[PDB]
Amino acid sequence: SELIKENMHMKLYMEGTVNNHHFKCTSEGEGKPYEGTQTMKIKVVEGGPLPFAFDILATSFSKTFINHTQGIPDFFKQSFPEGFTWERITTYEDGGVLTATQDTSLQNGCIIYNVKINGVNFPSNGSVMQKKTLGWEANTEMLYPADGGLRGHSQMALKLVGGGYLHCSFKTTYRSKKPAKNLKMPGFHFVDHRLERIKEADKETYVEQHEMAVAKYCDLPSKLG
Amino acid sequence: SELIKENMHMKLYMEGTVNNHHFKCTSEGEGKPYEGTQTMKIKVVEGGPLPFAFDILATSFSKTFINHTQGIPDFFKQSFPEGFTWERITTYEDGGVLTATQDTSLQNGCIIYNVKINGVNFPSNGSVMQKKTLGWEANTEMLYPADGGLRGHSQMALKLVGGGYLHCSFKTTYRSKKPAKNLKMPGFHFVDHRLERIKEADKETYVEQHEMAVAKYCDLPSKLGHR
Amino acid sequence: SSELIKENMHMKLYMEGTVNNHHFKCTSEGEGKPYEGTQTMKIKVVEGGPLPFAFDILATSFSKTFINHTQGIPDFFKQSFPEGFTWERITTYEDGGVLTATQDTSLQNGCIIYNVKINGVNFPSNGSVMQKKTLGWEANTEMLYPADGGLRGHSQMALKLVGGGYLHCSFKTTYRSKKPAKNLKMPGFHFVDHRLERIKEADKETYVEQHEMAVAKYCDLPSKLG
Amino acid sequence: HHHHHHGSSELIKENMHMKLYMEGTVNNHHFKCTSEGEGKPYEGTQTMKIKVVEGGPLPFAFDILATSFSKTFINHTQGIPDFFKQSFPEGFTWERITTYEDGGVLTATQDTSLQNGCIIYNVKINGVNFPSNGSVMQKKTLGWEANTEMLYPADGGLRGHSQMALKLVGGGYLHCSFKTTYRSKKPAKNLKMPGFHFVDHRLERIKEADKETYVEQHEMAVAKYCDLPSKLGHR
């Protein structure tokens, strides 16, 4: 994947609505695609300060930055120069849902993200609308081919002020802009993620996030096969 | 609201994405707000023809047109001149999800809708993407106050070619732009809907829809004297 | 059309189950008017009482023969006798609890007989159900059509809470006849309006009387199409 | 510091046997199963030999019952407290609902006890709405992939969240997820609760006979924290 260098920059545009609060964000980032690490610096540029926890947006800000181990084919790095899209719905156990659609392209050496967010039904006294959340635990995504692309299933735990967790889960479809004939698809595998907030300011209108992500098989040996 | 006359027109703009496919629609319509009937004439103006059944968009194109029976307060008509919003997620039994957020306003005597659609994960070879659908049956929405607005719960049956159905359900929150103290909130009630397609052309890039909607209580007697 | 189902019928029920990991058994006796769609059941918790959860979560598990089928809608349940029928259902509450139930309905010496198994899980420890903050169900409208070799129902119900709020639940049911499909006239798409009410209680909900009225009908609104 | 290996759960030996009784219904098909097994509780490995003793042959894929047949056999690494092994002699329960993407649901409740040195399981199954033409009722499934369960305290016990992939005849997968609550019969004051952590599982069918009325299953299960470093110093 020669177009994806050891170090890459990214730029992002996001617009969305959560319940009926409209906003726009931009971000600039850098990372090491083959090491599976990256940092994004994010600005809320319209609609700030947001009345909901920024944590619900965190997964919507970068699939080229996954260290693919154990010979697992890399759906995302193979997709350049054409790029790829993703689409996702996250459901929170207390009723809120966050839907996101995303385009990833490569333009003059910079990876470009365009994201649309539609979140609905977040409960008025829930931790998200009360801004009583404290970031995500690590998680393991489970992936396999489906629907002409790559399906992901994830489950994440959101830390709460006062202790304990709010659960969510999401279903993602990643779609390449290359035709299947020109891709080596992975089989069933996992991606371990640790998505962290490293800095913030001004009531979450400035946020820095770091992610480490590694594609791998399960640690445990198989009796069969 | 006296601002809502016995006959009203509406205009709509919509933009969205379904499974990576971007599109825009506009529409014009007319209806009888107190009688609960309306017709909208819809154009796909960008991104057409759509690669999915237009039926999944039908509920996203009008809450001021509900006949409120039995004295049930009308959350929507009371909200003018300020207007109201709605937000919704529809989940289909085969994996698709259709999220929508909407703004309703009143401008120069015309009701104005602005809608954003985000649909994801519709199965690639399923009924929606293969255009095997034939419109909706009637349904009964269940409503009550929640979350600082009015909560709706709906379950609908989409007719399929060959005679079956595809199930979906949705959860809606309707929010007024008037403060709660200036509204008479309804209690628990139902709205019966019949949302029908009455014309189409050009691979569903022109569609006409009619809806009738009537708010009511359950008319079965109650041993406990409840509505 | 269904000679075995008389204007007045009696019922007897046995139920065993677990909610979270609390085991219990119930019995009940009832009577109703199958063609008028009304019935009353008098229910006893006979093992495992008092229950640590609101009895409201069990209400829908205690009677499909008692629905007034209007407008010519075929009656899947009354037609199923003498062989009888079964139902299976999962109810999901918005705060995480789930209540699964499977039921057998038979007719024995002129009495309708119910055998029910309940498995409820993950009800939140400090939630409305375990803290007994519930006040019975609102009315509701079930939506039905054939599927999976039987009759599919979809329901959504609102549980009243102390203080005036609601807890939502929904459920999916499959009703299955013990008659072969060839010997049944299947209904098409239709609704059943229900009003399920508690009329008496004693002894920390270890004695409960419930009444239900149920009516099968089409939507009242006219169609432009068809 | 305890003086002896495994001093924090002495009734659980390095080798243990188990016996199980199960009864249930799927759609409205009633059945009963029994099983006997053995495993190495601290190593996280075990094998169960299962018989369908009433209601066989089953008209649905046995794969949907696989997770209902053993929490004492998890290798807890990295010092993670072992909720299950700590719970003896009193034992523990679990309760779970599994939702399949094509509409079927499999609910299960379970009691675990220790009787004369043998671990005893009593399980109740209630499965509903499995679609008539789905892979489960058509018996077109081919066992589970590995998975990673996510766990943390909640509801006075230990919450688990799981997502699994069921291999299908012809290729591809059917998705399910489940939510579990594990509950100790010891009071909270006598337990050292773990924090947030993961359990990797690989649940495999190693033998079957007579239209799935005899099945042998092996499982390996290992509790761990996420491997990856944390910029914030978290586990």
Description:
The structure is a homotetramer. By secondary structure, chain A is mainly beta. Chain A has one domain (1-225): Green Fluorescent Protein (Beta Barrel), CATH 2.40.155. Chain A has no helices and 13 strands. Chain A has strands at 8-18, 21-32, 37-46, 67-68, 84-92, 97-107, 110-120, 133-136, 139-146, 149-160, 165-176, 189-201, 206-216. Chain A has an 11-stranded mixed barrel. In chain A, strand 10 (149-160) and strand 11 form a beta hairpin. At the A-D interface, strand 9, strand 10, strand 11, strand 12 and strand 13 of A face strand 9, strand 10, strand 11, strand 12 and strand 13 of D.
Number of helices of chain A: 0
SSE class of chain A: mainly beta
User: What is the approximate shape of chain A?
Assistant: globular
Spell out the CATH superfamily of chain A: Green fluorescent protein
Count of folded domains of chain A: 1
User: How large a portion of the residues of chain A is in β-strands, by DSSP E?
Assistant: over 45%
SSE run of chain A: EEEEEEEEEEEEE
Largest sheet of chain A: 11 strands, mixed, barrel
The value of Rg of chain A in angstroms is 17 Å
What is the name of the CATH class of chain A? Mainly Beta
